Amino acid sequence: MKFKKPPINNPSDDATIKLAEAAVSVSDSMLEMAKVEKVITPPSKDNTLTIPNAYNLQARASVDWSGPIEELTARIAKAAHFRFRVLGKSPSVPVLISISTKDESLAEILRDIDYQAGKKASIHVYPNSQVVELRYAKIY
Amino acid sequence: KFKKPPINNPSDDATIKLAEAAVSVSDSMLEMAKVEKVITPPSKDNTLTIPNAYNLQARASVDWSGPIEELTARIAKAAHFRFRVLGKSPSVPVLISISTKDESLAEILRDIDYQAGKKASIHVYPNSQVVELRYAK
Amino acid sequence: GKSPSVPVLISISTKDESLAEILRDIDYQAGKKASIHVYPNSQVVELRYAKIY
Amino acid sequence: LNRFRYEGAGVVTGNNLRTSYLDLYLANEGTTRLAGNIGLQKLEAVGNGVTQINGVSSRNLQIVLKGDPKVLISGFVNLRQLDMYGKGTLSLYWIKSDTLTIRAKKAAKIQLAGIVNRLDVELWDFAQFKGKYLRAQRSFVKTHDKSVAEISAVNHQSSLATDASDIYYYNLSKTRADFMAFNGSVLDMREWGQSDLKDFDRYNKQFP
Amino acid sequence: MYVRTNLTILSPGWLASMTSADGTHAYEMQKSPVLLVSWHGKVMQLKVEGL
Amino acid sequence: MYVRTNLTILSPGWLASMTSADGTHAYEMQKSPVLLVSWHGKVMQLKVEGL
Amino acid sequence: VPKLPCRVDGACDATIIKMMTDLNKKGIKVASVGQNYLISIPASALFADQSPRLNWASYSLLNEIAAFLKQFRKIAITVTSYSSKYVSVKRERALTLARSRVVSEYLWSQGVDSRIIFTQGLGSDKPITSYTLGGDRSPNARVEITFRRAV
Amino acid sequence: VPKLPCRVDGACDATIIKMMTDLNKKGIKVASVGQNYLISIPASALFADQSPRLNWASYSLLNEIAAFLKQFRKIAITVTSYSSKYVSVKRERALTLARSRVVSEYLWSQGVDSRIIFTQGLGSDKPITSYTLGGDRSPNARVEITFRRAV
Amino acid sequence: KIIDEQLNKQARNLDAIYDFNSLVLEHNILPPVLLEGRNTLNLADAQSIRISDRTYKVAKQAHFITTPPTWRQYLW
Amino acid sequence: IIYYIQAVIPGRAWLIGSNGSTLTVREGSKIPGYGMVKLIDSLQGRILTSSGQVIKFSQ
Amino acid sequence: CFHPPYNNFQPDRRAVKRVGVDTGGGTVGLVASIYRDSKRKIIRDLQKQDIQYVEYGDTRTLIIPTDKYFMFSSPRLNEICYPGLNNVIRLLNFYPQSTIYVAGFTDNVGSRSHKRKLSQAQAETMMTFLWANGIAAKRLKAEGYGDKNAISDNAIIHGSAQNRRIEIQWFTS
């Protein structure tokens, strides 16, 4: 004789309600901008050709890091047992990235690192020589 | 006997909506950076390859931050290779900044070329063991 | 058309009519501000604002 | 040439025979070479015979087997149903169909490759289903004790293992669901050294 | 405010900075009771008083 | 009086008005304690206190 | 004085000592030298035989080991999976990879504030016992957790 | 602050629960899902055989369901009337149209707080069961009221 | 106190969703801030109105930045 | 135009072109627009031919 | 005696163990068993859980909350509410001839393709789960829609929580 409905949770907070109500419109705006930009400029290639995948690079990982990139790439080189190398100089303005994902390939993690780097630094791998080498933007 | 759920599960509906929004905006931003990012082909990559000669595999602890001409002549003399230059020294000298304790001198020269970029370049002949510093016009 | 900034306000009080006459009635009530057309061959009800000024 | 039933240690060789349909019922070592282009719908081998057919193309075919044959057919067949209850081997070159039912009881060595829109697999015991190079839109596989199956699912994959049952997929299905009861196993057995291997996404990241 | 450390200070905006040859960073910036750095990929707060 | 909502104002008039891309409405009128809105075809009066 | 915490929260070193000795009496290998801590578990107390299915009671031991691992300050943990020789190389390589993936996912679900989880499995390439009579009961099949305490 | 109304007048959730349970045991189907509510009444509880006339006993039930519907806050109401095949198609459609019109008129003229009420009927054109043995006693002969609770 | 506790409770999705650091241009410069307006009408007085379809305003100009901001100087 | 791969046995393969045309190819075969296939792969879905292109599956 | 992992996909045997521990009267165990396996107490236990059961005419429908029964943003089936799933199996064993339509629904935020993929994946998950319990593969049809038809508005928080759902419809003949 009782009557219920399916979704029942622990109670909420109105400030969290207002935060989510901002966040939905923010998400829609960002989706709008990204869709229009992708439409107006068509890409040509991708970083898969720059970064292939070889054996021992198929170990898995899950991460949460929010710092300068150098400790992160040194740790991933120590995982891969690869020769780690730098090129150029890190500028006085540091490069900070934030990755919080779940169970990815090392190669896809590195491609995400390059994409979030964008026009500040670039990454390359010589797999046969087993080397991960970065290069900062040699400009300014 | 007992299995627990994850601790910071989004139990609350506001948390559900918020985390979903975060996932959506993360994938959108990664998409936009991907569609705007400029890459380079690994065939047209104007970079110095490894010269893979025998003598270039010594360990050196090198600190320098200044002109490049004395540095390349000094590492050539350390390598017992001949060295010459093709081009003219400009008024403002080419400047570099390299400090390391143990690398290959060959990839050190590769880093010299990479910091040089446009105005300078380097060739190496291993048969007649020479290093050539090529200036730009 | 373009919805103008000044809203177009319609008050209706009527019981037990048909849809077509409701449509014709409110199109008459709008008058010089808008127009309604119906394409029943394509099942499309279309309205238009007034291109004025 | 309508119905051909044979027993008793025969060798028949033929090529360039044109027919709409004929029914073969072979027994007791029929060594057959058929290098023609023949449509047919039914075939029966009683047991303990080896038969290789080069070229069969029909709109339809229904086949069951009873003994221990060693058969292989070349061509394209829109098969529907296949049941194996003995100690049989089978291999087809191409299949272009939509609905496939497979029942395996005792010992089957089946080698198929082609395009099937919907595949159902039942394996009971000592089944060795090598269905690699066989792309499927929908795959539904149920394996009981000591059954090994090799699948190549593309889009929708459903897998169940009771115990001591090996199920090896070979492609990244856009939807994967797997279950094991007592001692089952769902595994990839991929290569990992390819230049263009892709990882999972948020839609198929199922943890066994 | 003048601060010597070896972490990477993020939040309140630093006016100028320099580095040693060994990873020690030197910052000078406005007055704030609070700093916000990155340690090892974890963000940390820093309480400063005594102004 | 500076009023933001997503309703439609009726009675006192206003001097200026603008609308967002989502249907939000922003208005500009003189001092008044009350407002009129046709919310969903139904007339409502809104109380504004503390003028 | 109450404005600064006197210790890292959720830490009592007596309780840490007690749970370490409890795990050693339970039969779980715990070892350390300086800052490098390693713990080793045979796979027979977790999985089915040559299988990536998990017993229900094993979640309790997973809860206990997560409660131990919440104590220290950490950065990167590495979990490796090891097995015996069964059919191929691919079979046990995939088995170790799957087992490492499962234990990594549930560990990440639990609240251990490490920045990095590395998982890898190698199958049967580096055994630690020449006596190879047993199958999955033999202690060469195992899982290892390695990390370094920091400051 | 205290002069503002604490609740919507003429409303109590306990009264809502009690009257919907009474309707449910009375035999009229009550259906609640999300914010959209459905109430369906069999036709022979309201009319005589194939006839667009109201029996005098039906007005008590009509008053009851009107007092139920006034409790919520609505914008749009929709009523549908359905029947069985008798002679024609348009004859049954016209019967449903008349029935829905009559009940819509009475519900409007009673003090319910709707804004817009649509009425239409079709008859046998959208059945709900394969049991067509009964005539106007058949359970598919029905009237449905649907609305959405607005905030 | 409770809302500062809740904002510390939900942490990583907040700086995840408010990525300033991808918004930075090539030369470490904060992009400037723009505002929109749809369907403007203002009446000045009798016999005097002014309408416009879309309006846009620059709020604050672009400049150099030594660090990307966070949400803490907006929400704490 | 392009082609696509359908099923691969070790030695022979099934191919579908852009216009829906079908082919079954040997170890050595001739395809106009692409020439002569030198070798195939059965573990991988790649075809090595005289024109230097590599065929793949649908995405 | 039992296993929490879905009783290892065996035929679940609750009543015989119940009458065994009841005899440890026999008629008391019998009346307890016929109270427990009765459909009314099954529906009431589903109402004690968070599952919505609706019968109307001959079409029978079931509604399951995805946020409760699933790990977040995932096609992973959450393992906590296995008593609810056992109740689901025991109820749906009753009509072994009706075909099954199953569908999934999500809210209104994000990429439409992403919503469609998530709903179709969850639909295939539930379909596979039912397929793993003695149901022939021709008896099912799965579909995952996006936000094509809500039951409550997604601009208010509780309705937005209500909107995503799992829908199970089945017929009679």
Side-chain angles (χ1 to χ4, degrees):
Chain A
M1 48 290 299
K2 291 210 164 184
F3 283 85
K4 291 177 93 73
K5 283 301 184 56
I8 158 180
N9 312 133
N10 312 131
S12 332
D13 140 76
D14 58 322
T16 321
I17 299 308
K18 293 192 166 69
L19 282 152
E21 112 91 358
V24 44
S25 352
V26 163
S27 61
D28 198 290
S29 326
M30 187 70 184
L31 171 62
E32 150 75 18
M33 188 269 331
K35 163 176 158 297
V36 172
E37 180 78 281
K38 181 247 179 181
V39 160
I40 185 53
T41 309
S44 54
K45 316 137 300 167
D46 58 328
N47 43 346
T48 300
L49 180 53
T50 66
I51 312 299
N53 47 331
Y55 209 78
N56 111 274
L57 227 72
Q58 303 318 113
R60 317 210 46 80
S62 82
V63 89
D64 165 80
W65 189 277
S66 66
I69 82 180
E70 278 71 20
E71 216 154 355
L72 204 48
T73 173
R75 288 275 201 271
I76 206 60
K78 192 69 62 51
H81 322 270
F82 269 25
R83 294 187 68 251
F84 171 69
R85 195 165 50 184
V86 308
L87 279 187
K89 288 308 290 176
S90 128
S92 34
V93 173
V95 172
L96 300 323
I97 42 177
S98 183
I99 307 300
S100 152
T101 55
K102 285 302 294 150
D103 191 24
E104 282 80 18
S105 109
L106 312 178
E108 298 317 291
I109 283 302
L110 255 68
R111 290 180 192 169
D112 285 24
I113 290 312
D114 181 34
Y115 270 147
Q116 207 162 107
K119 278 182 288 177
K120 295 302 181 179
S122 308
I123 194 61
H124 282 77
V125 44
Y126 296 147
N128 38 330
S129 82
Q130 307 182 343
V131 174
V132 263
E133 150 262 335
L134 82 120
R135 48 191 88 166
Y136 301 93
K138 194 53 230 65
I139 204 47
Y140 339 112
Chain B
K1 50 191 287 275
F2 288 100
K3 160 67 176 52
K4 298 191 176 304
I7 288 98
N8 315 70
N9 284 313
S11 90
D12 189 79
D13 38 9
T15 317
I16 279 292
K17 182 167 300 300
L18 182 67
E20 182 268 346
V23 171
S24 59
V25 70
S26 62
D27 300 19
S28 167
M29 185 175 288
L30 170 75
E31 270 282 330
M32 189 254 301
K34 176 183 305 191
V35 88
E36 82 109 343
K37 206 265 179 52
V38 36
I39 63 188
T40 160
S43 51
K44 305 182 183 63
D45 38 358
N46 180 31
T47 40
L48 174 66
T49 160
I50 156 80
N52 67 83
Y54 168 68
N55 309 35
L56 309 179
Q57 281 76 9
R59 336 273 77 254
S61 193
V62 178
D63 178 32
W64 173 267
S65 187
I68 91 171
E69 208 283 329
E70 273 292 327
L71 208 65
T72 181
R74 194 54 51 183
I75 188 53
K77 179 56 222 307
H80 314 79
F81 278 28
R82 293 173 300 272
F83 157 72
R84 42 169 186 271
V85 284
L86 261 55
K88 298 181 56 54
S89 170
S91 303
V92 36
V94 185
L95 303 182
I96 43 176
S97 83
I98 290 96
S99 171
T100 161
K101 200 143 296 186
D102 166 52
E103 287 305 320
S104 149
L105 46 138
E107 67 203 345
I108 273 166
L109 260 313
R110 173 171 162 83
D111 181 86
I112 295 299
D113 188 80
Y114 178 53
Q115 281 187 12
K118 197 64 64 188
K119 318 128 300 296
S121 290
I122 155 191
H123 285 50
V124 35
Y125 295 109
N127 35 5
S128 64
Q129 287 78 18
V130 76
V131 278
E132 169 54 53
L133 179 65
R134 201 166 306 178
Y135 280 75
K137 321 174 182 185
Chain C
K2 275 301 291 185
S3 160
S5 56
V6 169
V8 195
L9 298 326
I10 299 301
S11 183
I12 293 301
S13 171
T14 15
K15 289 292 122 169
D16 190 33
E17 290 85 9
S18 81
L19 296 167
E21 300 320 291
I22 283 302
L23 255 305
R24 291 174 175 178
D25 207 330
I26 64 155
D27 178 82
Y28 252 146
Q29 194 76 22
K32 297 180 59 52
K33 306 291 296 182
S35 298
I36 317 294
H37 311 264
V38 172
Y39 303 101
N41 48 335
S42 185
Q43 305 175 331
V44 171
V45 36
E46 161 251 40
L47 91 114
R48 52 186 74 178
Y49 294 98
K51 182 55 220 61
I52 205 47
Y53 318 137
Chain D
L1 303 173
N2 328 116
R3 183 194 319 269
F4 186 84
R5 318 188 53 179
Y6 182 79
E7 301 82 21
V11 176
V12 188
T13 300
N15 33 35
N16 319 280
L17 297 328
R18 279 123 179 84
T19 157
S20 151
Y21 162 68
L22 24 72
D23 206 339
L24 276 313
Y25 209 108
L26 270 82
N28 310 122
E29 279 81 18
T31 302
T32 304
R33 302 299 98 81
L34 240 305
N37 30 10
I38 288 96
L40 66 129
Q41 225 284 147
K42 291 283 185 176
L43 185 136
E44 290 302 313
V46 173
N48 194 14
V50 32
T51 291
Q52 166 190 7
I53 311 168
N54 203 331
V56 162
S57 62
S58 90
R59 197 262 321 160
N60 201 340
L61 181 86
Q62 187 58 227
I63 153 80
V64 87
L65 287 179
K66 37 222 164 298
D68 313 318
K70 285 91 221 169
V71 294
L72 57 145
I73 315 152
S74 185
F76 336 103
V77 156
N78 202 114
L79 197 140
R80 249 40 62 90
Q81 185 194 345
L82 182 55
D83 310 317
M84 182 57 63
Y85 287 82
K87 292 93 226 145
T89 64
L90 205 149
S91 74
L92 305 190
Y93 268 120
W94 311 111
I95 22 177
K96 195 261 177 189
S97 160
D98 47 347
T99 301
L100 231 296
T101 305
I102 291 297
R103 252 59 170 172
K105 178 68 63 182
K106 203 64 64 193
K109 312 303 156 310
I110 315 173
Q111 180 187 359
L112 313 176
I115 329 287
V116 162
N117 299 334
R118 186 189 178 110
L119 166 67
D120 185 283
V121 170
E122 158 60 49
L123 307 186
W124 287 104
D125 48 88
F126 298 105
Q128 300 195 11
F129 173 74
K130 322 292 182 60
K132 217 161 68 165
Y133 331 107
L134 177 63
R135 319 194 80 83
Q137 315 308 293
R138 314 289 306 269
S139 59
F140 316 103
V141 173
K142 176 183 302 172
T143 57
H144 289 277
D145 47 347
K146 287 195 178 50
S147 23
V148 188
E150 323 274 347
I151 345 176
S152 178
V154 186
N155 320 99
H156 305 75
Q157 187 260 4
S158 151
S159 26
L160 177 55
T162 68
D163 58 320
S165 12
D166 289 16
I167 299 163
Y168 305 149
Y169 52 92
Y170 280 97
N171 206 15
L172 308 168
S173 85
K174 285 177 184 177
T175 317
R176 159 175 68 92
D178 321 309
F179 289 93
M180 34 209 49
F182 301 95
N183 289 305
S185 42
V186 164
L187 271 321
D188 185 18
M189 213 143 297
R190 247 185 310 168
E191 175 254 23
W192 312 6
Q194 219 184 332
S195 74
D196 48 348
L197 199 57
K198 42 171 53 58
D199 211 339
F200 295 138
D201 312 310
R202 299 172 56 248
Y203 309 104
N204 43 328
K205 199 159 287 165
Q206 283 303 119
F207 283 85
Chain E
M1 286 181 55
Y2 284 73
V3 32
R4 152 203 260 258
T5 171
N6 40 9
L7 289 326
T8 308
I9 172 66
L10 309 181
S11 66
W14 47 263
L15 197 68
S17 77
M18 214 184 305
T19 334
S20 61
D22 39 72
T24 310
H25 288 251
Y27 288 86
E28 62 98 43
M29 56 166 306
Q30 259 51 56
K31 32 187 57 184
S32 143
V34 33
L35 280 324
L36 189 73
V37 302
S38 138
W39 186 55
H40 283 138
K42 197 185 189 53
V43 196
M44 229 58 58
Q45 312 185 4
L46 271 184
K47 187 183 185 177
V48 176
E49 57 259 23
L51 299 195
Chain F
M1 308 187 59
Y2 286 73
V3 38
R4 172 186 200 254
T5 169
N6 30 11
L7 295 172
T8 322
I9 321 200
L10 300 178
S11 50
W14 34 261
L15 305 182
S17 66
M18 286 168 74
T19 292
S20 79
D22 312 335
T24 354
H25 288 182
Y27 290 81
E28 220 54 67
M29 68 280 292
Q30 306 296 98
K31 299 227 302 301
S32 73
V34 89
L35 268 321
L36 232 174
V37 153
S38 177
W39 158 64
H40 264 49
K42 203 272 319 151
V43 143
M44 208 121 55
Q45 351 185 227
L46 289 325
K47 184 204 176 184
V48 173
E49 78 175 23
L51 283 179
Chain G
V1 183
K3 296 100 58 184
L4 321 171
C6 202
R7 54 178 189 260
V8 40
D9 309 24
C12 175
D13 312 5
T15 62
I16 294 176
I17 262 295
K18 192 188 65 50
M19 70 181 84
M20 166 153 51
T21 326
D22 197 7
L23 289 193
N24 280 338
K25 292 310 171 190
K26 199 171 294 296
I28 300 307
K29 194 54 190 175
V30 187
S32 203
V33 266
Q35 283 89 283
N36 323 332
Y37 282 78
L38 143 132
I39 41 182
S40 144
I41 298 182
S44 297
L46 284 193
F47 305 96
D49 169 82
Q50 309 277 350
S51 306
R53 196 184 67 88
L54 267 310
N55 304 347
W56 199 270
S58 39
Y59 270 140
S60 62
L61 203 68
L62 270 173
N63 187 87
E64 186 173 6
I65 195 178
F68 168 74
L69 217 68
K70 276 207 307 305
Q71 292 276 349
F72 305 148
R73 199 155 305 184
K74 40 187 56 55
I75 27 183
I77 335 285
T78 293
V79 36
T80 53
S81 182
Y82 287 143
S83 67
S84 170
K85 173 58 67 183
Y86 198 63
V87 163
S88 92
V89 280
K90 270 78 53 180
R91 216 274 180 178
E92 72 274 31
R93 276 192 180 178
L95 174 61
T96 41
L97 183 54
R99 289 172 154 165
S100 61
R101 245 182 52 176
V102 155
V103 66
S104 64
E105 190 202 14
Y106 176 65
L107 248 302
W108 188 263
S109 77
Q110 299 310 296
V112 249
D113 46 358
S114 172
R115 313 278 89 82
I116 285 101
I117 285 295
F118 283 154
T119 130
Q120 58 186 26
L122 291 172
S124 62
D125 311 338
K126 195 53 180 70
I128 55 178
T129 292
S130 65
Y131 181 82
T132 54
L133 235 313
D136 292 11
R137 300 298 199 176
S138 152
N140 51 338
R142 59 185 179 276
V143 280
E144 307 178 6
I145 315 294
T146 66
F147 70 104
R148 179 185 283 163
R149 183 185 196 180
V151 186
Chain H
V1 189
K3 297 101 63 180
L4 315 167
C6 185
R7 68 151 175 266
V8 40
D9 39 7
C12 177
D13 60 335
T15 59
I16 280 181
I17 290 300
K18 179 185 59 52
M19 69 183 56
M20 70 94 55
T21 329
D22 294 5
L23 252 42
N24 194 45
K25 80 177 57 53
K26 259 294 189 54
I28 150 192
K29 185 78 193 53
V30 206
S32 158
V33 37
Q35 290 166 340
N36 299 27
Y37 288 167
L38 160 75
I39 32 165
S40 186
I41 311 183
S44 290
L46 234 287
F47 312 97
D49 167 77
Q50 315 272 38
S51 61
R53 190 171 61 97
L54 305 188
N55 321 27
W56 210 278
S58 54
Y59 273 144
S60 57
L61 208 58
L62 248 293
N63 178 82
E64 176 59 45
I65 189 59
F68 165 71
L69 208 265
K70 203 230 296 298
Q71 190 103 147
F72 288 90
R73 179 169 312 195
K74 68 230 58 62
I75 159 184
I77 317 294
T78 301
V79 281
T80 48
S81 167
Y82 291 124
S83 71
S84 160
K85 290 163 194 176
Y86 199 29
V87 164
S88 125
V89 270
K90 65 228 70 52
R91 199 258 196 192
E92 288 84 329
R93 288 180 193 173
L95 172 66
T96 50
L97 192 136
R99 286 174 150 172
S100 71
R101 267 189 43 186
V102 162
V103 64
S104 69
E105 179 262 8
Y106 182 52
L107 230 287
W108 172 257
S109 198
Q110 291 296 126
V112 89
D113 203 271
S114 159
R115 328 253 34 82
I116 288 98
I117 296 174
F118 300 133
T119 150
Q120 88 276 60
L122 264 83
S124 60
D125 327 359
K126 192 198 195 77
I128 53 179
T129 157
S130 58
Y131 187 84
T132 71
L133 271 310
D136 285 356
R137 299 302 189 188
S138 156
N140 62 335
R142 71 197 186 276
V143 275
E144 307 103 333
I145 317 181
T146 65
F147 78 103
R148 152 168 291 180
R149 169 167 182 192
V151 188
Chain I
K1 173 70 164 45
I2 299 304
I3 190 46
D4 275 309
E5 268 303 308
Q6 208 61 51
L7 203 53
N8 198 97
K9 218 285 169 187
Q10 180 38 253
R12 277 317 304 271
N13 306 134
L14 191 49
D15 53 310
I17 194 168
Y18 282 2
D19 189 297
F20 284 149
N21 26 321
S22 46
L23 266 308
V24 196
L25 306 180
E26 188 176 35
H27 285 65
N28 322 348
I29 159 176
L30 173 72
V33 34
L34 272 311
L35 265 321
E36 82 104 349
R38 301 269 179 85
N39 193 22
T40 81
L41 155 76
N42 164 52
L43 160 133
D45 54 306
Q47 317 103 12
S48 70
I49 39 178
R50 189 164 176 194
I51 83 171
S52 283
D53 33 9
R54 281 180 168 177
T55 54
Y56 300 98
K57 163 171 193 175
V58 176
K60 324 172 186 186
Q61 239 109 342
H63 50 65
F64 291 149
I65 33 161
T66 181
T67 163
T70 137
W71 47 265
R72 251 120 172 168
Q73 62 274 50
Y74 290 81
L75 296 188
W76 191 263
Chain J
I1 68 179
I2 68 170
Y3 272 70
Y4 258 161
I5 313 177
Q6 272 64 43
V8 168
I9 212 52
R12 304 211 321 272
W14 197 357
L15 234 58
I16 280 293
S18 313
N19 38 17
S21 64
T22 166
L23 281 92
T24 300
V25 283
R26 222 80 187 175
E27 172 55 56
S29 302
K30 310 301 160 291
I31 161 76
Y34 302 113
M36 152 67 166
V37 37
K38 292 99 64 257
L39 70 113
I40 69 164
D41 197 303
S42 184
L43 304 177
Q44 283 72 28
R46 45 185 61 247
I47 301 301
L48 267 64
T49 179
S50 50
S51 53
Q53 65 103 348
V54 37
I55 324 181
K56 285 298 171 184
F57 286 88
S58 59
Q59 314 303 126
Chain K
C1 301
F2 194 69
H3 249 45
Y6 338 115
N7 213 30
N8 322 313
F9 292 86
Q10 281 290 320
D12 45 342
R13 308 301 307 180
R14 188 70 163 175
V16 277
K17 294 175 56 191
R18 279 300 288 186
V19 300
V21 302
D22 281 324
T23 48
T27 61
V28 187
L30 248 299
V31 299
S33 169
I34 68 164
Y35 250 26
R36 279 297 182 189
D37 91 304
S38 52
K39 190 162 297 192
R40 299 166 48 246
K41 202 65 172 176
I42 280 301
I43 293 162
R44 185 154 297 188
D45 176 50
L46 258 322
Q47 196 68 26
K48 265 179 302 302
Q49 270 67 80
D50 45 334
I51 310 297
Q52 173 61 266
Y53 161 69
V54 160
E55 184 181 27
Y56 170 73
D58 287 331
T59 297
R60 300 217 175 96
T61 47
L62 260 305
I63 284 301
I64 302 178
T66 144
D67 323 2
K68 266 276 178 41
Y69 268 66
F70 277 81
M71 319 182 51
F72 155 73
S73 155
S74 74
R76 318 197 62 210
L77 171 63
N78 178 35
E79 274 71 22
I80 300 176
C81 304
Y82 70 96
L85 298 190
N86 295 353
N87 296 338
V88 155
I89 294 297
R90 281 185 296 268
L91 181 65
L92 221 63
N93 285 126
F94 269 95
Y95 320 113
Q97 287 80 21
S98 32
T99 102
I100 311 299
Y101 283 111
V102 280
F105 296 100
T106 156
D107 41 357
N108 66 324
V109 33
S111 140
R112 37 205 289 175
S113 53
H114 155 66
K115 302 177 200 79
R116 167 156 40 88
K117 284 184 186 54
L118 194 130
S119 359
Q120 191 160 324
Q122 261 180 302
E124 207 86 8
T125 331
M126 190 60 62
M127 195 200 215
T128 297
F129 175 76
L130 264 310
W131 176 90
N133 294 270
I135 304 177
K138 67 201 62 53
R139 310 193 52 194
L140 316 173
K141 184 62 166 62
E143 195 43 69
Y145 298 100
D147 41 6
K148 287 301 187 179
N149 31 9
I151 77 187
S152 299
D153 151 74
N154 297 34
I156 309 301
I157 294 307
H158 199 67
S160 183
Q162 284 270 14
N163 186 215
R164 53 197 88 86
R165 55 189 183 276
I166 283 302
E167 151 172 326
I168 298 182
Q169 310 164 339
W170 76 100
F171 288 153
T172 306
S173 168

